[PDB]
Design a protein around this motif. Structure first.
Motif, PDB file in Angstrom:
ATOM      1  N   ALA A 262       0.854  -1.217   0.000  1.00  0.00           N
ATOM      2  CA  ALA A 262       0.000   0.000   0.000  1.00  0.00           C
ATOM      3  C   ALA A 262       0.880   1.254   0.000  1.00  0.00           C
ATOM      4  CB  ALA A 262      -0.922  -0.006   1.201  1.00  0.00           C
ATOM      5  N   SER A 263       1.863   1.297   0.900  1.00  0.00           N
ATOM      6  CA  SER A 263       2.902   2.353   0.952  1.00  0.00           C
ATOM      7  C   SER A 263       3.563   2.483  -0.424  1.00  0.00           C
ATOM      8  CB  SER A 263       3.901   2.046   2.026  1.00  0.00           C
ATOM      9  OG  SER A 263       3.227   1.749   3.238  1.00  0.00           O
ATOM     10  N   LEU A 264       3.936   1.356  -1.039  1.00  0.00           N
ATOM     11  CA  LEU A 264       4.682   1.359  -2.330  1.00  0.00           C
ATOM     12  C   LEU A 264       3.774   1.965  -3.400  1.00  0.00           C
ATOM     13  CD1 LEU A 264       6.955   0.837  -4.201  1.00  0.00           C
ATOM     14  CD2 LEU A 264       6.485  -1.597  -4.127  1.00  0.00           C
ATOM     15  N   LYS A 265       2.527   1.499  -3.448  1.00  0.00           N
ATOM     16  CA  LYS A 265       1.479   2.014  -4.369  1.00  0.00           C
ATOM     17  C   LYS A 265       1.423   3.554  -4.331  1.00  0.00           C
ATOM     18  CE  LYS A 265      -3.597   2.189  -4.621  1.00  0.00           C
ATOM     19  NZ  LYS A 265      -4.822   1.383  -4.850  1.00  0.00           N
ATOM     20  N   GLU A 266       1.399   4.171  -3.146  1.00  0.00           N
ATOM     21  CA  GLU A 266       1.237   5.652  -3.026  1.00  0.00           C
ATOM     22  C   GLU A 266       2.544   6.363  -3.400  1.00  0.00           C
ATOM     23  OE1 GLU A 266      -1.665   7.479  -2.725  1.00  0.00           O
ATOM     24  OE2 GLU A 266      -2.498   5.438  -2.928  1.00  0.00           O
ATOM     25  N   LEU A 267       3.693   5.753  -3.095  1.00  0.00           N
ATOM     26  CA  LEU A 267       5.010   6.272  -3.562  1.00  0.00           C
ATOM     27  C   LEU A 267       5.049   6.233  -5.085  1.00  0.00           C
ATOM     28  CD1 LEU A 267       7.396   4.639  -0.966  1.00  0.00           C
ATOM     29  CD2 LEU A 267       7.150   7.092  -1.418  1.00  0.00           C
ATOM     30  N   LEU A 268       4.589   5.134  -5.688  1.00  0.00           N
ATOM     31  CA  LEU A 268       4.598   5.001  -7.172  1.00  0.00           C
ATOM     32  C   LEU A 268       3.649   6.042  -7.762  1.00  0.00           C
ATOM     33  CD1 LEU A 268       4.742   1.122  -7.570  1.00  0.00           C
ATOM     34  CD2 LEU A 268       6.423   2.756  -8.422  1.00  0.00           C
ATOM     35  N   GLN A 269       2.476   6.244  -7.137  1.00  0.00           N
ATOM     36  CA  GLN A 269       1.391   7.149  -7.617  1.00  0.00           C
ATOM     37  C   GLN A 269       1.695   8.616  -7.272  1.00  0.00           C
ATOM     38  OE1 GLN A 269      -2.044   5.332  -5.841  1.00  0.00           O
ATOM     39  NE2 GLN A 269      -2.456   4.032  -7.610  1.00  0.00           N
ATOM     40  N   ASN A 270       2.299   8.902  -6.100  1.00  0.00           N
ATOM     41  CA  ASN A 270       2.509  10.291  -5.593  1.00  0.00           C
ATOM     42  C   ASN A 270       3.951  10.785  -5.751  1.00  0.00           C
ATOM     43  OD1 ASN A 270       0.289   9.339  -3.145  1.00  0.00           O
ATOM     44  ND2 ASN A 270      -0.080  11.162  -4.399  1.00  0.00           N
ATOM     45  N   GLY A 271       4.913   9.909  -6.034  1.00  0.00           N
ATOM     46  CA  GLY A 271       6.348  10.236  -5.948  1.00  0.00           C
ATOM     47  C   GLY A 271       6.779  10.415  -4.501  1.00  0.00           C
ATOM     48  N   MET A 272       7.936  11.041  -4.275  1.00  0.00           N
ATOM     49  CA  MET A 272       8.565  11.162  -2.935  1.00  0.00           C
ATOM     50  C   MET A 272       8.588  12.621  -2.448  1.00  0.00           C
ATOM     51  SD  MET A 272      11.667   8.410  -3.216  1.00  0.00           S
ATOM     52  CE  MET A 272      12.274   8.939  -1.619  1.00  0.00           C
ATOM     53  N   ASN A 273       8.175  13.575  -3.278  1.00  0.00           N
ATOM     54  CA  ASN A 273       8.023  14.992  -2.853  1.00  0.00           C
ATOM     55  C   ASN A 273       9.366  15.513  -2.324  1.00  0.00           C
ATOM     56  OD1 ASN A 273       4.943  15.379  -3.188  1.00  0.00           O
ATOM     57  ND2 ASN A 273       5.094  13.490  -2.003  1.00  0.00           N
ATOM     58  N   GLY A 274      10.470  15.149  -2.981  1.00  0.00           N
ATOM     59  CA  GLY A 274      11.826  15.649  -2.670  1.00  0.00           C
ATOM     60  C   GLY A 274      12.372  15.082  -1.367  1.00  0.00           C
ATOM     61  N   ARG A 275      11.654  14.137  -0.757  1.00  0.00           N
ATOM     62  CA  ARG A 275      12.104  13.396   0.448  1.00  0.00           C
ATOM     63  C   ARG A 275      12.985  12.232  -0.012  1.00  0.00           C
ATOM     64  NH1 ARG A 275      10.562  14.807   4.345  1.00  0.00           N
ATOM     65  NH2 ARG A 275      10.602  12.885   5.617  1.00  0.00           N
ATOM     66  N   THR A 276      13.673  11.578   0.919  1.00  0.00           N
ATOM     67  CA  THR A 276      14.634  10.489   0.628  1.00  0.00           C
ATOM     68  C   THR A 276      14.379   9.298   1.553  1.00  0.00           C
ATOM     69  OG1 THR A 276      16.243  11.298   2.176  1.00  0.00           O
ATOM     70  CG2 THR A 276      16.364  12.156  -0.125  1.00  0.00           C
ATOM     71  N   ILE A 277      14.728   8.101   1.084  1.00  0.00           N
ATOM     72  CA  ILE A 277      14.641   6.836   1.867  1.00  0.00           C
ATOM     73  C   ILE A 277      16.027   6.207   1.773  1.00  0.00           C
ATOM     74  CG2 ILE A 277      13.547   4.556   2.053  1.00  0.00           C
ATOM     75  CD1 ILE A 277      11.061   5.919   0.647  1.00  0.00           C
ATOM     76  N   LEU A 278      16.674   6.006   2.923  1.00  0.00           N
ATOM     77  CA  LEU A 278      18.066   5.486   3.005  1.00  0.00           C
ATOM     78  C   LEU A 278      18.959   6.235   2.031  1.00  0.00           C
ATOM     79  CD1 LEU A 278      17.260   1.692   3.361  1.00  0.00           C
ATOM     80  CD2 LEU A 278      18.200   3.265   5.066  1.00  0.00           C
ATOM     81  N   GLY A 279      18.859   7.566   2.015  1.00  0.00           N
ATOM     82  CA  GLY A 279      19.788   8.452   1.287  1.00  0.00           C
ATOM     83  C   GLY A 279      19.555   8.418  -0.206  1.00  0.00           C
ATOM     84  N   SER A 280      18.413   7.891  -0.655  1.00  0.00           N
ATOM     85  CA  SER A 280      18.064   7.817  -2.095  1.00  0.00           C
ATOM     86  C   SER A 280      16.770   8.601  -2.340  1.00  0.00           C
ATOM     87  CB  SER A 280      17.970   6.384  -2.555  1.00  0.00           C
ATOM     88  OG  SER A 280      17.550   6.333  -3.913  1.00  0.00           O
ATOM     89  N   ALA A 281      16.689   9.338  -3.449  1.00  0.00           N
ATOM     90  CA  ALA A 281      15.486  10.089  -3.876  1.00  0.00           C
ATOM     91  C   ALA A 281      14.699   9.252  -4.889  1.00  0.00           C
ATOM     92  CB  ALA A 281      15.886  11.431  -4.437  1.00  0.00           C
ATOM     93  N   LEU A 282      15.094   7.995  -5.105  1.00  0.00           N
ATOM     94  CA  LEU A 282      14.288   7.034  -5.898  1.00  0.00           C
ATOM     95  C   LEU A 282      14.239   5.660  -5.220  1.00  0.00           C
ATOM     96  CD1 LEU A 282      16.770   5.435  -7.355  1.00  0.00           C
ATOM     97  CD2 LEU A 282      16.631   7.281  -9.002  1.00  0.00           C
ATOM     98  N   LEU A 283      13.327   4.818  -5.693  1.00  0.00           N
ATOM     99  CA  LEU A 283      13.043   3.473  -5.145  1.00  0.00           C
ATOM    100  C   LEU A 283      14.123   2.504  -5.648  1.00  0.00           C
ATOM    101  CD1 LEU A 283       9.188   3.729  -5.718  1.00  0.00           C
ATOM    102  CD2 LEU A 283      10.435   4.042  -3.600  1.00  0.00           C
TER     103      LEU A 283
END
Ligand SMILES: *[C@](O)(C(=O)NC1CC1)[C@H](C[C@@H]1CCNC1=O)NC(=O)[C@H](CC(C)C)N1C[C@@H](NC(=O)OCc2cc(F)cc(F)c2)CCC1=O
Ligand SMILES: *[C@](O)(C(=O)NC1CC1)[C@H](C[C@@H]1CCNC1=O)NC(=O)[C@H](CC(C)C)N1C[C@@H](NC(=O)OCc2cc(F)cc(F)c2)CCC1=O
Lengths: 303, 303
Positions: A266-287
């Motif tokens: 569900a989280s992945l679905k909204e990241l794919l649909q909404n993007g990351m809004n210039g936020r980062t996950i483990l120092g990456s701005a993409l999946l």
């Protein structure tokens, strides 16, 4: 605690790299017991590469046409054959550094360490994934051919990859150690298509779990989803369809985190649909899709 | 051809890792000649860590209190001293695998390979930068202390880092091999601040050059700039101020590409001011600062 792209220690594989020379062509070989493995296109000339008949090219060559150099010592070639797109040179001397080893065909989505080599000398080591389209995102210059990918299994080296070629996309192709290409590639200089480059969905979920274990949990939403509903959204974004096998592989990461696989989807679905809004996950701005569940556990368990 | 986060081959350093045990604490040591180097907090108990008097803690210990295990073989400790935050254990046996080596204090912005170790067994290898604030973005679990960072200089290993601690920010601190911490950190369990985490500007320029050499050149604009004008925009974004030394270091990359350093600074300015608009450079959606010019040349020249 941190999460990083991590290679296996390279030392066991370092002592297996030699130099192979035929005419003007120098590249890397893998010296295991009394056999040296290398790309068969070592026999090719600049112009042979357009459409080579390897069988006829190999027939103009004898044992003494192959220069195999371990460091400063020349090995004596007492035999040669072609196995698919690799040349096996039989040598008089068994490698005294031969580790316990296996040859495996890796599956798409699995990762391995590449020991990038020039002139039979190890240059550097980085982690790659066999992508769904049977390519890798490597760092390979003129002279790198014969560089190998591998896994370590406590003591036992599992060689899975030998480097042969660069594709127009800036992306790399090669064989297993029996000389069968990963994917539809052939060892000739012609226009060749890697397919659509799909994302390894189970790997992205492993990486979102790694994020959560390391305290990065902003992308977690109040929703949940179904396999079929998530997989309808995967398809749209060129993601591999998630299966119940994939769900089961992730279970140790679910169990450690307390986050159900479907809640993470569900989280992945909204990241794919909404993007990351210039936020980062483990120092990456993409999946990131080049970490397997095992890689995540290994690093988040300390193997 | 590709650009990747690449570590040095680890084999020379693998044969130098041992296990060090004092009471209940087990961690990693570096066995070079007849000396074993490890973090002095190996002598500490759970509660000693709040405010340890290392001098008094070390005084309750003798040679025979230290268990040094190379693989399955126990070494005999015939001497010990404290040098700053490292313990030097003198042993009866000189390491027969000791490579040609040096101990160097690395400067901020320079990179090294980390061989992540547990129980004196090498686990994995990844590249790190000594960040301007004297921290590293590593992957270090319970048991990793005594793991070392290093550079290879053809044959000669330059050890620069020994791992000691994790900071609240999920970020790591340790010493050179003389036991002097990088940065203001102390080996005790108290609230400790890494400063503001500034970006290594010369590294980002090296990475934008690497992008251009690899055919990724969308972020190039029609403009140019001045040191003082760029450095006014750097300051705003917590970038290290660019100096003429920095410009000179980049010259081989300028020369190879035909793009003046100041023209690249203009591109960087608009990326910092405009963002990347969901586009990517070398597979990253953010500006990477953990590649030095040397790293870029080494990888884009094939050392
Ligand atoms: C190795 O053979 C090698 O290192 N050889 C030693 C230098 C003597 C190299 C490794 C490549 C070279 C550059 N970076 C690499 O990874 N491989 C080759 O030379 C390949 C030989 C073929 C027989 C497989 N090879 C030759 C060329 N093939 C080609 O032009 O295909 C069409 C093409 C490809 C492309 F990427 C873009 C196009 F528009 C067209 C070049 C690529 C290659 O890997
Ligand atoms: C090594 O000593 C080690 O591997 N020891 C072997 C397991 C016996 C570890 C490595 C850490 C552990 C977890 N991941 C690591 O990298 N280091 C330590 O144990 C440190 C010992 C100190 C004497 C330096 N250490 C102890 C704790 N320090 C602490 O609580 O500081 C305040 C703090 C820190 C923080 F990150 C957040 C806070 F809110 C407060 C824990 C951290 C540490 O590295």
């Amino acid at each position: 605690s941190g999460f990083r792209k991590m290679a296996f220690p390279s030392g066991k594989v370092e002592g297996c790299m030699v130099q192979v020379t035929c005419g003007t062509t120098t590249l890397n070989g893998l010296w295991l017991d009394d056999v040296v493995y290398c790309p068969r296109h070592v026999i090719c000339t600049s112009e042979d590469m357009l459409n080579p008949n390897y069988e006829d090219l190999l027939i103009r060559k004898s044992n003494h046409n192959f220069l195999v150099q371990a460091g400063n010592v020349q090995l004596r070639v007492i035999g040669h054959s072609m196995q698919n797109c690799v040349l096996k040179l039989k040598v008089d001397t068994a490698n005294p550094k031969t580790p316990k080893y296996k040859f495996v065909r890796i599956q798409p989505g699995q990762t391995f360490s590449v020991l990038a080599c020039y002139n039979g000398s190890p240059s550097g080591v980085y982690q790659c994934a066999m992508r769904p389209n049977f390519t890798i995102k490597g760092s390979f210059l003129n002279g790198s051919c014969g560089s190998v990918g591998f896994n370590i299994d406590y003591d036992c080296v599992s060689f899975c990859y030998m480097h042969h070629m660069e594709l127009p996309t800036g992306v790399h192709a090669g064989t297993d150690l029996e000389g069968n290409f990963y994917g539809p590639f052939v060892d000739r200089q012609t226009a060749q298509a890697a397919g659509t480059d799909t994302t390894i969905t189970v790997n992205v979920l492993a990486w979102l779990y790694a994020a959560v274990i390391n305290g990065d949990r902003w992308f977690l939403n109040r929703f949940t989803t179904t396999l079929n509903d998530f997989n309808l959204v995967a398809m749209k974004y060129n993601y591999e369809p998630l299966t119940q096998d994939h769900v089961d592989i992730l279970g140790p990461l679910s169990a450690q985190t307390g986050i159900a696989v479907l809640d993470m989807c569900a989280s992945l679905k909204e990241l794919l649909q909404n993007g990351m809004n210039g936020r980062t996950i483990l120092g990456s701005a993409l999946l990131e899709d080049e970490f397997t569940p095992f890689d995540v556990v290994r690093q988040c368990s300390g193997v």
